Each structure stands twice: as C-alpha cells, then as structure tokens.
Ligand binder design. Structure first.
Ligand SMILES: CCCn1c(C(=O)c2cc(C)cc(C#N)c2)c(C(C)C)c(=O)[nH]c1=O
Lengths: 553, 403
C-alpha cells in the first residue's frame, strides 16, 4: 500500500533548481525492462505518467540481477541529491546489546517495500520526473514522476524513519510496557508478557501498522533467536559477538593483518584481555595491501594469547536497571588498558580496551584518568548512568597526583582493587632546594642553520663539561644538558635551567615518552634520591646561567 | 503581537551541533518540561526536514530541574542582529555601584512569538538511552531563553516595562544581558533589597516572577615575597617573577637584584641584600599594585580569560584581549572536586565580566577537554554558556600569579 500519513515537506537548496540531466539512449531489452517495471509500478500507485511542461529529468537504467534472469530499475539521483535540502540524521548511534533489558517476549517485524509505502511531498514529485527513451531514441519517451519515496534519493531514509515514528507513537503511548526498536525498516518488539498476551499485542500492533499502509510478516513468518544483527548474536538471556575465526596462514599480507586487527577489536567488547599492540606495530610503514609482513616474535606471542582467549565462547548478560554498574580496569601492558563492566561478578555486561596516549609524555595516573573518562561517557551512552569504579591505584597515590598536578582532574566514585600491576608515581621531584647537594647550572643550544649542537653544565663545585650533538634542535640539547647533570651527579642534585620546555616535560612526572632522551632522563630520575629542578630566565646574566651559557656556542 | 523578522548572518547557515549524551534522570526531566511547554505551545514537534540542531541539557539552578539550551552556535550565526541592528548598550556605571542584584527575567520571552522563518534554527533533540528510539525533536515558536536575539527583540517591551521604576529612581542602574536583569544602586543594603522588591512587583504585572558588590572588586596584584633570609633560589625566583611582570608593567626593574647572582652559587646559600636592590624591590611593589598603564578595553575585540589551579582550592585568573595586557586579575576560593570549583570560577568570572564590559570572555581552561566535557553540566547553574577551549598551563605562568 501507500500509507495515508501526512507527507513531509521537501525543498531543494535555496539558490538551486531541480535536475535536468539528459537521458542516455538505452538498448532495446533495457527499454522493454523499464516499461515492464514502470507499468507495474503505476498500477501499484508508486509513479505516474506526466507530460512536459515538466522540464526535469533524472536518468534511468536497468540492470540484470545478477546471474538470475530478473531485471531491476536503477535511478541515478546523483544530481537531484546534490540539489536537495539537507535532512536531519536518520539515526546517530546504534544500540549496544549490553544496553538491552532482558525480555519475556520478543518478535521481529519487517516492513515490506518500505520506501514505496510512503508518500513523497506532492509539491516535490515534479523533480523526480524521469524518462524512458524510445527505441534508438527516436520518439518522445514515456515520462513518469514518483508519488512515493524513491530508492536512492537523499531524503528517503530520513523521511521513512520519521513516518514510522509518527505511526508508532499512539501505540507506544497506549502500550508503554512494550518496547519497539526501530532500525532501518525493521521493528523489534519486546515485552514481559506471556506468549499469549504477547502475540495478542503483536497482531494488535500489525493491525495498527496495516491501517497505516504498513504490511508485515505474520505469526508464521517471524524469525527466531538468535537474531544475528550488526555484528552481534543475540539470544534470549545473553549476547555475544558473531562467531570469529582467525585465519591460519604462513604468509600474512598487510590486508590479512588489517582484517585480523579489526575482527579482534570487535571481539574485544566481550572477550576480556584481547591485545593488538604487537599486531598494530606491524602495520606502520608505507606498504601496499599485497605486501606480506613477517610477524615479529612479540606479535606472534600476541596472536597466541588472542588465539587462546577466543577458543572457548564467552557471552555478555543484559542490563538490570535496579543494580549498580561496576567498572573494573587493568593495566594490561605498555600504555594498553582493558576493562570490564558488570553488575554481578564476574558476569560481564561488556568488556573494552583503551590504548590511546595523550601527548608525547604521560604517566599511568594520567592514562588511567583518561580511561575512566572514556569508560564513563560510554556508560552514559549505553545505560544512562555512570558506573562505580574499581581501579588498580591506592587512594594516596591518586591523592598525591591530583593535588600537586596543575590540571584540574576528577574521577567519580571509585575503590582500590589490588589487581597488579598497580599504578604508582615513579619519582617525586623536591619542592625545595637540597642542601649539600651539588647545584648543576646546565644549558643547551644549536645553530638553526648548521643544526650543530652543544650541551653542557657548570657546577658550584667548579665542575664543567660540554659535549657536542650533531643535527639536534635548540630544545633537544636542553634535555641533553639535563640528562648530563643527572649522569654526572650523586643521589641528590639541584639542577638549574633556562628551558621552560625541559621544565614542563620533567615537572609533569612522565614515566614513559615518545622520546629516547626523555626515557633515559626518566630512568635516571628513578635511580636518584632527591632531585630539585629549578628554572631561570635566559640571557639575564643570572647566577651561573651566564657561565655555562658561554661554554655552549 | 507582530513578530520582528530575524535574519542570520549573510551566507552562513544555521547550527548543526549534535546532542551530547544525557543521563536517564536528565532525559526524563527534559521530557516532562518539554511535554509541558508544547501544551503551552512554546515549542512544536518537528520533522526530518529540519536539518538544524543545538544541544540541550538539564540543570538545578533550588531542587527543580530547569532546561538549558546551548545557543552558542546560533548566537554566533546571528550576531549581526543582537549586536548591531538592535543592541542593548552597556552602562559603565554598573561596576561602580555599591550593590548589584541579578534577576532572572527569561520567563518574559515565552510570551513573544518568534519570526516564523527563523524557528527552524532553534531545533533541539531530546536523545534516548542506548539509542533505543529516535530522539524527540522540537523547535521554538516563542523567543527562547539563551538566545541573544530574545533580549534584543524584547528591548522595546523591557523599556516600557521598566520605564516607571526608572523615572522614580533615576539614580539606579538597570542592565539587561541575555536572560538576566542587573540592578545596581548605592543604597544601604536593606533599602537596596527593598528597592529590588518594588522592582519585582512591576515585573510581576507582566509575567516575570543574589547580590554582587562590584566596589569590593580589586586587582590580585603580583605578589613579591618579603623575607627574613633570601637564598639564591629565592632570588632566582624573584628575578623570574619580575622578569615576567616587566612584559606587563612599564618601569619594572631587575638589575640591582641580579647583581646578587654572580658566579655559580649553591641554591641553598644565603645572600645578604643590597641597598639598591631593596629600593628596586619596593618601587616594583609600587608598580605591581597599580593597574597597567597603557592597557585599554577594545569593544571590537574578544575578551579572553585564563585560570590557573593554585592548589588548596585556590584559583587565579586574568582577563585581557592582547596577551599580557591584563584588563584585570583575581583569585577565587573554597567540595574538593576540581571540576566543581572550576565551574564555579568560570561563572563568577563571567558574571564580573558581564558587569564590567557587557561581554563574556572565551575561557582557557586548565583541564583535559574530555574530563571537562563529561562533568561541567553537573555544576553549571547559570543561564548563559561562555565559549571555552582547553589549555595546558605553562608551569611558569601558574607560579607567577601564586599568592
Ligand atoms: C532477544 C533478546 C535481545 N533483546 C531485544 C532484541 O531482540 C533486539 C535488539 C536490538 C537492538 C537489535 C535486534 C536485532 N536484530 C534485536 C529487545 C528489543 C525489543 C529492543 C529487548 O528489549 N531486549 C532484548 O534482550
């Protein structure tokens, strides 16, 4: 049918007029095909013969489906698209399974000829005018316009979705104890009634759609669980991803490895502890898709763990609105984090995996704070509330970080759980100068053209030293001078610099870096006992600043 | 009543800002509220043919969920209108007044119809959890709170409404900024409060049902330590600080003090003071106390605000248009929630900013974008929303404004 529902007013973009593409002349079998379709369509009410005045045209085409002997009508709305208004998003975000409440009763309902069952803005049909050429293109062709929503037009998915929503509305108000999920042109219906009173309202629902143009599958034509969907496999009281098979190959091409990383990432939302770092290092470079990549030791070790975790099947449970959500996070490796959400231990609603790094230098406390946030937003999206957290970090560790760090920060309600590795601060810089500790005044520099570089220091006990660096930047040297002061000093040292740069880096208490130097500066800072870092203005003639400043050039 | 025709800025299109995820409690709240004002006909459901969108969410101002709309995008896309075509002039007298009370008059806009052909630009979406259903979409039919056009379009009515009260108290300053009325007088506080109540009654006959003290506003001057003993370390700090200050204040001198730091001394060593140095030190304090010479407000230019976390629930901030030309600086103090406090400071600073310049500043916030974006809505209880970007505080900036 063609639903009675009001139409949605459509416009074209404001400075624009509708399409006028020329019809490409079509062979004879294609002309015959299009006639056979379009007459059957105007019988159904879907289109209508017009006669020019109508100046508009979108080209037509017929294709063979595609070993069978059936044909199909393709329209190239390419241009009417371009000239049509933007619509609202048909749907932004799709439901995550782990967000679903368990249901007593489930039925899937499937709209038929959905787009063609919905009227097109009468004022707009004129722009849909298309034209079937005559044989060897000699006479005036047959010219139709759409009455319903054309397959492949810009406005159709939005307008259909909208129409299915106004039509479901009165029934939703009346049947609030029942959930309908609209995805594309399907419907999913669940309630906590018994199969009887369920199919009672199911039919009662179909007979509501039917008053409105919408024809559906009856009792005899409804699929049963699992309802594979969108990558998931959905059962009556639990869910999992669709079955994942890791290929078995001797050679791996870049394309074999990208597909694997994906299938793993997908598994990662219900299979705890999946890793992909070692496999991802592999993709770096400028290779083609056909290039075979020899797996590293650590990648194979890693494909191994993954190969095992996936061996036995795992499932996720459904959401019980009357319990708290509990999120558990573990440091799983070098900047890699894994988490689990559950309400009753340890039956997970879902699992997940955090791997980003923020900046060139972070420490675990920072990285852990970023995961909490990431996990928090996610929870808002899937369940509408934030979880109780359980983190591998003492309250005192966190409390010492928050307080002394300059950024504002905050995680919601959490608890320490002893799941090593624990996260700790790896060194504290002193808040005051050390006494009887050798004060190094360090400095570094570089010729912007030569790219030559000197880094050195002068101390108050008369020591000096200045090494040379080849092709280094004015700021690389400044870290070097500090690495320097740290190599050549005892377990306690004051260090003075003019680099706000170096300052900033070190005062952040990094514990990993995208820098070799900074990684070494770090391991030193670890080995020390007290270290006090201090900044001074360059070129003001301050302290021993001027001295070492001369040693370098 | 006849609707003022509203145009966007030339060429540019309306807001397409997507809706942030909301908590079930805020969603329910919004559903009620909106079901209500649709009955009353303030908003109507809209279809997919409206491409536009701006975020909404719920706050608590009192324990009655209010509905807030982020019209920042719309505001920028309309700002020929609320600035140059109409325009509510700022009184320089407001900051001078002994007491200023801020009144919410946004309920006033809900009476005036909105230009038919502008309404599509006010579309918002109440989202759904786990994307279970499509959001519920609405546009406005009346002037919306939060939009800079509503006070601009309602100016003629506000003047009429306020006209008698102004005539009867010609020495009282009343400013309108967005959803708020600002009322300043020099009266003793009881008389002042009494005068506000008279005002409410006038307001009350048209459907319009806290106290600043702007005088008590002064610089958070750059603070130079006074010390029993100075170590080299303490001198170097002192030089750093003055070396900063000299980019802002003219006259700043350092020389007599750097003299002290010749050679390579241990940091923890005590250097006694020069008669010159101590003379310098004082005249610097003279300068630091005073407002920057040569720094002036340019109404054609954006206000910027920067905030440093000082620890101990202390927060320093400066406002300026060209970096280091500070129009003013201050501190804000005293839950040990970092984000709660920051949110409070942003509102306070924005408030002062409106009173002095009729402008909100763009804020540079010392916090991870994502952290701030998750949480700020839990503590925001103001009716406008300023612009913000996110910034790592340079370790030196923070200390130079230390207290
Ligand atoms: C049957 C258990 C899953 N389930 C569903 C549901 O069946 C469903 C859900 C989604 C998002 C997609 C698909 C598909 N394909 C099916 C529902 C429906 C009625 C929303 C439910 O409420 N609870 C539930 O456990």
């Amino acid at each position: 049918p063609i639903s009675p529902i009001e139409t949605v007013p459509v416009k074209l973009k404001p400075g624009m007029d509708g399409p006028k593409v020329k019809q490409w002349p079509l062979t004879e079998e294609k002309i015959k095909a299009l006639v056979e379709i379009c007459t059957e369509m105007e019988k159904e009410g879907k289109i209508s013969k017009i006669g020019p005045e109508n100046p508009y045209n979108t080209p037509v085409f017929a294709i063979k489906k595609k070993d069978s002997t059936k044909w199909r009508k393709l329209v190239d709305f390419r241009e009417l698209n371009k000239r049509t208004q933007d619509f609202w998003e048909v749907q932004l975000g799709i439901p995550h399974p782990a967000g679903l409440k368990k249901k007593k009763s489930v039925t899937v309902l499937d709209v038929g000829d959905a787009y063609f069952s919905v009227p097109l803005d009468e004022d707009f049909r004129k722009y849909t005018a298309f034209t079937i050429p005559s044989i060897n293109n000699e006479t005036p062709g047959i010219r139709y316009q759409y009455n319903v929503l054309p397959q492949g037009w810009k406005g159709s998915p939005a307008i259909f979705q909208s129409s299915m929503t106004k039509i479901l509305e009165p029934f939703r108000k009346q049947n609030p104890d029942i959930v309908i999920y609209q995805y594309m042109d399907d419907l999913y219906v669940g309630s906590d009634l018994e199969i009887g009173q369920h199919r009672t309202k199911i039919e009662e629902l179909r007979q509501h759609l039917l008053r409105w143009g919408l024809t559906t599958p009856d009792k005899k034509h409804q699929k049963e669980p699992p309802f594979l969907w969108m990558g998931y496999e959905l059962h009556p009281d639990k869910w999992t991803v669709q079955p994942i098979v890791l290929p078995e190959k001797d050679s791996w091409t870049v394309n074999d490895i990208q597909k694997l990383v994906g299938k793993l990432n997908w598994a990662s939302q219900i299979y705890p502890g999946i890793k992909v770092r070692q496999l991802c290092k592999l993709l770096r470079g400028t290779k083609a898709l056909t290039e075979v990549i020899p797996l590293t030791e650590e990648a194979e070790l890693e494909l191994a763990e993954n190969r095992e975790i996936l061996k036995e099947p795992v499932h996720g449970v459904y959401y019980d609105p009357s319990k708290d959500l509990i999120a558990e996070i573990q440091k799983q490796g070098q900047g890699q984090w894994t988490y689990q959400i559950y309400q009753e231990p340890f039956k997970n609603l879902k699992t997940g995996k955090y791997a980003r790094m923020r900046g060139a230098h972070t420490n675990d406390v920072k990285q852990l704070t970023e995961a909490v946030q990431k996990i928090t937003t996610e929870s808002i999206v899937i369940w509408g509330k934030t979880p109780k957290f359980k983190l591998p970090i003492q309250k005192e560790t966190w409390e010492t970080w928050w307080t002394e760090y300059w950024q504002a920060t905050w995680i919601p309600e959490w608890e320490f759980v002893n799941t090593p590795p624990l996260v700790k601060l790896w060194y504290q810089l002193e808040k005051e100068p050390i006494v009887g500790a050798e004060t190094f005044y360090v400095d570094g520099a570089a010729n912007r053209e030569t790219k030559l570089g000197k880094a050195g220091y002068v101390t108050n006990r008369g020591r000096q030293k200045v090494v040379t660096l080849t092709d280094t930047t004015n700021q690389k040297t400044e870290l070097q001078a500090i690495y320097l002061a740290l190599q050549d000093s005892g377990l306690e040292v004051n260090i003075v610099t003019d680099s706000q740069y170096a300052l900033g880096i070190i005062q952040a208490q990094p514990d990993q870096s995208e820098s070799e130097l900074v990684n070494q500066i770090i391991e030193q800072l670890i080995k020390k006992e007290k270290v006090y870092l201090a900044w001074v203005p360059a070129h003001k003639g301050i302290g021993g600043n001027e001295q070492v400043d001369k040693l370098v050039s």
